């Protein structure tokens, strides 16, 4: 079951304050659904970088009083870990038709 997933070790996907260029280097050549979380160049915000159709996509993570997320009304998650675990089994497509992938493969899994 899902308890076995590498996502439960946050260090398999959270690469700290790595920038966009470093994320592109870490994800270059990786299979679709490989992802990481990192700080954004927008200070105080996080980003997901994920491979979709062989290309890296970068998504901002919002933080509201109800939690982290990608867009209202889904800013629900109390931590990055809860967000990642949710989107390991929920496609990002609900947010944008070009993001039909899950957060499937932590970069350091």
């Amino acid at each position: 079951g899902s308890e076995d997933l590498p996502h439960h070790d946050e260090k398999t996907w959270n690469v700290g304050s790595s920038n966009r260029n470093k994320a592109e280097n870490l994800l270059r050549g990786k299979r679709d659904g490989t992802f990481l979380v990192r700080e954004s160049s927008k200070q105080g915000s996080y980003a997901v970088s994920v491979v979709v159709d062989g290309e890296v996509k970068h998504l901002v993570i919002n933080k509201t009083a109800t939690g982290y997320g990608f867009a209202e009304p889904y800013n629900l998650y109390s931590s990055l870990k809860e967000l990642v675990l949710h989107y390991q089994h929920t496609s990002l497509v609900q947010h944008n038709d070009s993001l039909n992938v899950t957060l499937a493969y932590p970069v350091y899994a």
């Binding site: 966009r20 980003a47 970068h58 209202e72 944008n96 993001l99």
Partner: peptide, 8 residues
């Protein structure tokens, strides 16, 4: 940089 837009 450019981020993918995620409308509410």
């Amino acid at each position: 940089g450019v981020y993918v837009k995620m409308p509410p």
